């Protein structure tokens, strides 16, 4: 009996690999760090999706296809508002997306499809966020980037060069991350020759859960409690004496430091001095990591992604509610990618179980 | 590497057990045959759900709770029609159900909930079927049974004592059937402390697939090709000579005959002479099973459930399109049951995978 299937390797894939020991994470042959830092979400997507970075012309077309599928169909826009006020932006995303499922979505999923999804997700998220907040809806525009457009349809403004570059590098890191609950959920779902939508819809439903992609509220508060760098040590020092734990650090699967968390701290340095909510984090990190050395010497505890995900959001006034969604919109790539591959060489996840209950006699 | 996880037992459960070798299938301690044959869907549901048959008063209340949650909320009825004509009754069921997800549906799923779902599913299915068929909508009625109400909201009439008893015994057999694609899908989905709806929505999406609960069209035609018992042997005999295979027989997991298929043929005999579409099947079976003995002696090939599922439908003018749905509405019990249990003692399905692709050097 393999409870929760830990250590059970039920899949073969050339999309991504995560290596706890060696501190590394690879996307289709390249390092995540490199993609997060020196590329654009779109390039990234295109990689996880197809297998290589895109040519100078190769890309421009991909964008077009995207930019075009951002518009919310007439009835969809309408539906989002049909949906009553008691529905997480999540409970919704899940619903709405499902609403996209038609005849067009048959067994063999199609890039055409994987694309629509990836591209439209943020729009749903936003139009919905706006509506609930009684703000007037903001239509996407073939004019901005992808990660940048996501901001625009949410706020109405164009983000700081820093606020942007950061988020982007973030989403990219959230794009794909091996086999995890949801990603596995979709595969499983497509396992019965089902549709891309039904798979994403599944995965989505699975993301809603709090154990996967939940806001780092625990961290967000940490930061919110010390707006200035001065109080840096003070705070840490206090709760580090009666043994309380420092929220954004240490990891279950990363024995060495987290590459994602790493690729983030780095981009931050690049755009330092342009965003107080960010440059603060930088400090808090560096000042906290050197205090762990002190109070808990030996135990290699390194800053974990969750930490910076908390920071980047803090910088862009993305309250906790918009976390998971935003995350989803990104892992959306990972999913499709995984779906598209599951379908390449299918399977039938039929696992079995042990029956507890007593059995009746044939008599 | 365990591809598709065959032989992998990742779950413990006291809901159901399927035993290929010995020709038996057990629901919470009782035999399916017995439940299918001598009980009412509601009793059945109540069993898979709670663990025992219901008391004389114990039941009546369950019904009430059901009968009450059959009504389609104001906006839901409306939504079903919002949904464009290009959407399988399935693509819809999946959507709509998801539409039910609110705040009420949090981590620990609740019977209150498992119930609403089970009870409302058919209604969705129907109201939708009607609308597409340009028929006027038919409101459910606290007056008929459950399986019987499903017919009513679909047709507008009250089914033959035979047409009824049959279908009911059918759905009951479709209720739960161990760990299978979807049922597993829901568990997986709830694995991250998600909601009942998101789980069912997942499972649903997984059912849509053609490899799970697809119509036995292959069989349905067999029957449709010989309206009268006379042509019985004739037909069979022909395609059985150049080695063509007889669609409703033999099974992958049932070495001995299928109990479901069995529990069905039986109920049929009980209500013989009252339904030509049914009494025909009876014959075709018996006349075909005795021809297999003849052409392929030795190989214990026994009639398989799929066969009768094809027949019962044929009798009630339930074209192939309504198959999966109808099936879903039933397995809906199995699901909830399984969800409700997954949550009792959760887990985290984190399985892992083998990366094909080449890795880059640290450099
Ligand atoms: C995930 C976990 C616990 C790391 O797993 P592991 O270190 O491999 O397994 P552990 O039980 O933690 O190892 C025990 C040790 O961790 C140390 N440790 C880890 N994080 C610590 C922290 N923030 N503060 C103090 N000690 C910490 C303990 O001091 C202990 O070392 P000693 O017994 O020698 O003193 C991580 O340290 C953590 O708690 N992170 C905060 C939760 C989080 O990531 N939240 C994000 C969403 S809110
Ligand atoms: C599912 C399957 C193939 C049974 O699995 P198994 O019998 O365990 O594995 P098999 O490959 O079939 O065993 C091979 C044998 O099956 C026999 N067989 C099974 N069903 C047969 C049929 N309908 N007609 C003729 N032979 C059949 C073959 O004759 C062969 O025996 P021999 O080589 O000695 O002649 C089943 O027989 C079948 O084909 N059913 C029809 C498909 C179905 O169930 N459809 C429902 C949805 S449309």
Coordinates of N, CA and C in Angstrom, one line a residue, chain A residues 199-303:
Chain A
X199 N -9.8 19.1 -18.4 CA -8.6 18.8 -17.7 C -8.2 20.1 -16.9
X200 N -8.1 21.2 -17.6 CA -7.8 22.4 -16.9 C -8.8 22.7 -15.8
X201 N -10.1 22.5 -16.2 CA -11.2 22.7 -15.2 C -11.0 21.9 -14.0
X202 N -10.4 20.7 -14.2 CA -10.2 19.8 -13.1 C -9.0 20.4 -12.3
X203 N -7.9 20.6 -13.0 CA -6.7 21.1 -12.3 C -7.1 22.4 -11.5
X204 N -7.8 23.3 -12.2 CA -8.3 24.5 -11.5 C -8.9 24.2 -10.2
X205 N -10.0 23.3 -10.3 CA -10.7 22.9 -9.1 C -9.7 22.5 -8.1
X206 N -8.7 21.8 -8.5 CA -7.7 21.3 -7.6 C -6.8 22.4 -7.0
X207 N -6.5 23.4 -7.8 CA -5.7 24.5 -7.3 C -6.4 25.3 -6.1
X208 N -7.7 25.5 -6.3 CA -8.5 26.2 -5.3 C -8.1 25.8 -3.9
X209 N -7.8 24.5 -3.7 CA -7.4 24.0 -2.4 C -6.4 24.9 -1.8
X210 N -6.3 24.9 -0.4 CA -5.4 25.8 0.2 C -4.0 25.2 0.3
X211 N -3.8 23.9 0.2 CA -2.5 23.3 0.3 C -1.7 23.4 -1.0
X212 N -2.2 24.0 -2.0 CA -1.5 24.2 -3.3 C -1.7 25.7 -3.6
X213 N -0.6 26.3 -3.9 CA -0.7 27.7 -4.3 C -1.6 28.7 -3.5
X214 N -1.4 28.6 -2.2 CA -2.2 29.5 -1.3 C -1.4 30.7 -1.1
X215 N -2.0 31.8 -0.8 CA -1.2 33.0 -0.5 C -0.3 32.8 0.7
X216 N 0.9 33.5 0.7 CA 1.9 33.4 1.7 C 1.5 34.4 2.8
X217 N 0.2 34.6 3.0 CA -0.3 35.5 4.0 C 0.7 35.5 5.3
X218 N 1.1 34.4 5.7 CA 2.0 34.3 6.9 C 3.2 35.2 6.7
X219 N 3.7 35.3 5.5 CA 4.8 36.1 5.2 C 4.4 37.5 5.0
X220 N 3.4 37.7 4.1 CA 2.9 39.0 3.8 C 2.7 39.8 5.0
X221 N 2.3 39.2 6.1 CA 2.1 40.0 7.4 C 3.5 40.4 7.9
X222 N 4.4 39.4 7.9 CA 5.8 39.7 8.4 C 6.2 41.0 7.8
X223 N 6.2 41.1 6.5 CA 6.6 42.4 5.9 C 5.8 43.6 6.3
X224 N 4.5 43.4 6.2 CA 3.5 44.5 6.5 C 3.8 45.0 7.9
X225 N 4.4 44.3 8.8 CA 4.7 44.7 10.2 C 5.9 45.5 10.4
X226 N 6.7 45.8 9.3 CA 7.9 46.5 9.4 C 8.2 47.4 8.2
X227 N 7.3 48.1 7.7 CA 7.5 49.0 6.6 C 8.9 49.5 6.3
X228 N 9.7 49.7 7.3 CA 11.0 50.2 7.2 C 12.1 49.2 7.5
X229 N 13.3 49.3 6.8 CA 14.4 48.4 7.0 C 14.9 48.4 8.4
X230 N 14.9 49.6 9.1 CA 15.4 49.7 10.5 C 14.9 48.6 11.3
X231 N 13.6 48.4 11.5 CA 13.0 47.4 12.3 C 13.3 46.0 11.8
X232 N 14.2 45.9 10.8 CA 14.5 44.6 10.2 C 14.9 43.6 11.3
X233 N 16.1 43.6 11.8 CA 16.6 42.7 12.8 C 15.6 42.6 14.0
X234 N 15.3 43.8 14.6 CA 14.4 43.9 15.8 C 13.4 42.7 15.7
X235 N 12.5 42.8 14.7 CA 11.4 41.9 14.6 C 11.9 40.4 14.5
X236 N 12.6 40.1 13.5 CA 13.2 38.8 13.4 C 13.7 38.4 14.7
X237 N 14.7 39.0 15.2 CA 15.4 38.7 16.5 C 14.3 38.3 17.6
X238 N 13.3 39.1 17.8 CA 12.3 38.8 18.8 C 11.7 37.4 18.7
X239 N 11.0 37.1 17.6 CA 10.3 35.8 17.5 C 11.3 34.7 17.3
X240 N 12.6 35.0 17.0 CA 13.6 34.0 16.8 C 14.2 33.5 18.1
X241 N 13.8 34.2 19.2 CA 14.4 33.8 20.5 C 13.5 32.8 21.2
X242 N 12.2 32.9 21.2 CA 11.4 31.9 21.9 C 11.2 30.7 20.9
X243 N 12.0 30.7 19.8 CA 11.9 29.7 18.8 C 10.8 29.7 17.8
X244 N 10.1 30.8 17.7 CA 9.1 31.0 16.6 C 9.8 30.8 15.3
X245 N 9.2 30.4 14.3 CA 9.8 30.2 13.0 C 9.6 31.3 12.0
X246 N 10.6 31.6 11.2 CA 10.6 32.7 10.2 C 10.0 32.2 8.9
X247 N 8.7 32.6 8.7 CA 7.9 32.1 7.6 C 8.4 31.8 6.2
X248 N 9.2 32.7 5.6 CA 9.6 32.4 4.2 C 10.8 31.6 4.0
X249 N 11.2 30.7 5.0 CA 12.4 30.0 4.8 C 12.4 28.5 5.1
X250 N 13.3 27.8 4.4 CA 13.5 26.4 4.6 C 12.6 25.7 3.6
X251 N 12.9 24.5 3.2 CA 12.0 23.8 2.3 C 12.0 22.3 2.4
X252 N 10.9 21.7 2.2 CA 10.7 20.2 2.2 C 11.5 19.4 1.2
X253 N 11.4 19.9 0.0 CA 12.1 19.3 -1.2 C 13.4 19.8 -1.6
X254 N 13.7 21.1 -1.2 CA 15.0 21.7 -1.6 C 16.0 21.6 -0.4
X255 N 16.9 20.6 -0.5 CA 17.9 20.5 0.5 C 18.8 21.7 0.4
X256 N 19.2 22.1 -0.8 CA 20.0 23.3 -1.0 C 19.0 24.4 -1.2
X257 N 19.4 25.6 -1.4 CA 18.5 26.7 -1.6 C 17.6 26.5 -2.8
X258 N 16.4 27.2 -2.8 CA 15.4 27.2 -3.9 C 15.9 28.0 -5.0
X259 N 15.9 27.5 -6.2 CA 16.3 28.2 -7.4 C 15.3 29.3 -7.8
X260 N 14.0 29.0 -7.6 CA 13.0 30.0 -7.8 C 13.2 31.2 -6.9
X261 N 13.2 30.9 -5.6 CA 13.5 32.0 -4.6 C 14.7 32.7 -5.0
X262 N 15.7 32.0 -5.6 CA 16.9 32.6 -6.0 C 16.7 33.5 -7.2
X263 N 16.2 32.9 -8.2 CA 16.0 33.7 -9.5 C 15.2 34.9 -9.2
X264 N 14.5 34.9 -8.1 CA 13.7 36.1 -7.7 C 14.5 37.2 -7.0
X265 N 15.2 36.8 -5.9 CA 16.0 37.7 -5.2 C 16.9 38.5 -6.2
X266 N 17.4 37.7 -7.2 CA 18.3 38.3 -8.2 C 17.6 39.4 -9.0
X267 N 16.5 39.1 -9.7 CA 15.8 40.1 -10.5 C 15.6 41.3 -9.6
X268 N 15.3 41.1 -8.4 CA 15.0 42.2 -7.5 C 16.2 43.2 -7.4
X269 N 17.4 42.6 -7.2 CA 18.6 43.4 -7.1 C 18.7 44.3 -8.4
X270 N 18.5 43.6 -9.5 CA 18.6 44.3 -10.8 C 17.7 45.6 -10.8
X271 N 16.5 45.5 -10.3 CA 15.6 46.7 -10.3 C 15.5 47.3 -8.9
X272 N 16.6 47.2 -8.1 CA 16.6 47.8 -6.8 C 16.3 49.3 -6.9
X273 N 16.2 50.0 -5.7 CA 15.9 51.4 -5.7 C 14.7 52.0 -6.4
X274 N 14.0 51.1 -7.1 CA 12.9 51.6 -7.9 C 11.6 51.2 -7.2
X275 N 11.6 50.3 -6.2 CA 10.4 49.9 -5.5 C 10.6 49.5 -4.0
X276 N 10.3 50.5 -3.2 CA 10.4 50.3 -1.7 C 9.9 49.0 -1.2
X277 N 8.7 48.5 -1.7 CA 8.1 47.3 -1.2 C 9.0 46.1 -1.5
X278 N 9.8 46.3 -2.6 CA 10.8 45.3 -3.0 C 12.1 45.4 -2.4
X279 N 12.7 46.6 -2.4 CA 14.0 46.7 -1.8 C 14.0 46.4 -0.3
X280 N 12.8 46.5 0.3 CA 12.7 46.2 1.7 C 12.9 44.7 1.8
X281 N 12.1 43.9 1.0 CA 12.2 42.5 1.0 C 13.7 42.1 1.0
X282 N 14.4 42.6 -0.1 CA 15.8 42.3 -0.3 C 16.5 42.3 1.1
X283 N 16.3 43.5 1.8 CA 17.0 43.6 3.1 C 16.5 42.5 4.0
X284 N 15.2 42.6 4.3 CA 14.7 41.6 5.3 C 15.3 40.2 5.0
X285 N 15.3 39.8 3.7 CA 15.9 38.5 3.4 C 17.3 38.5 4.0
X286 N 18.3 39.1 3.3 CA 19.7 39.2 3.7 C 19.9 39.4 5.2
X287 N 19.1 40.1 5.9 CA 19.2 40.3 7.3 C 18.7 39.2 8.1
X288 N 17.8 38.4 7.5 CA 17.2 37.3 8.2 C 18.0 36.0 8.0
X289 N 18.5 35.8 6.8 CA 19.3 34.7 6.5 C 20.6 34.6 7.3
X290 N 21.1 35.8 7.7 CA 22.3 36.0 8.5 C 22.0 35.8 10.0
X291 N 20.7 35.7 10.3 CA 20.3 35.6 11.7 C 20.0 34.2 11.9
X292 N 19.8 33.4 10.8 CA 19.5 32.0 11.0 C 20.8 31.3 11.2
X293 N 21.8 31.8 10.5 CA 23.2 31.3 10.6 C 23.5 31.4 12.1
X294 N 23.2 32.5 12.7 CA 23.4 32.8 14.1 C 22.6 32.0 15.1
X295 N 21.3 32.0 15.1 CA 20.5 31.3 16.0 C 20.4 29.8 15.8
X296 N 20.4 29.4 14.5 CA 20.4 27.9 14.2 C 21.6 27.7 13.3
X297 N 22.8 27.6 13.8 CA 24.0 27.3 13.0 C 24.0 25.8 12.5
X298 N 24.5 25.7 11.3 CA 24.6 24.3 10.7 C 23.4 24.0 9.8
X299 N 22.2 24.0 10.3 CA 21.0 23.7 9.5 C 20.9 24.7 8.3
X300 N 21.3 24.2 7.1 CA 21.2 25.0 5.9 C 19.8 25.4 5.6
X301 N 19.3 26.5 6.1 CA 17.9 26.9 5.9 C 18.1 28.1 4.9
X302 N 17.5 27.9 3.7 CA 17.6 28.9 2.7 C 16.2 29.5 2.4
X303 N 16.2 30.8 2.0 CA 15.0 31.4 1.6 C 14.3 30.6 0.6

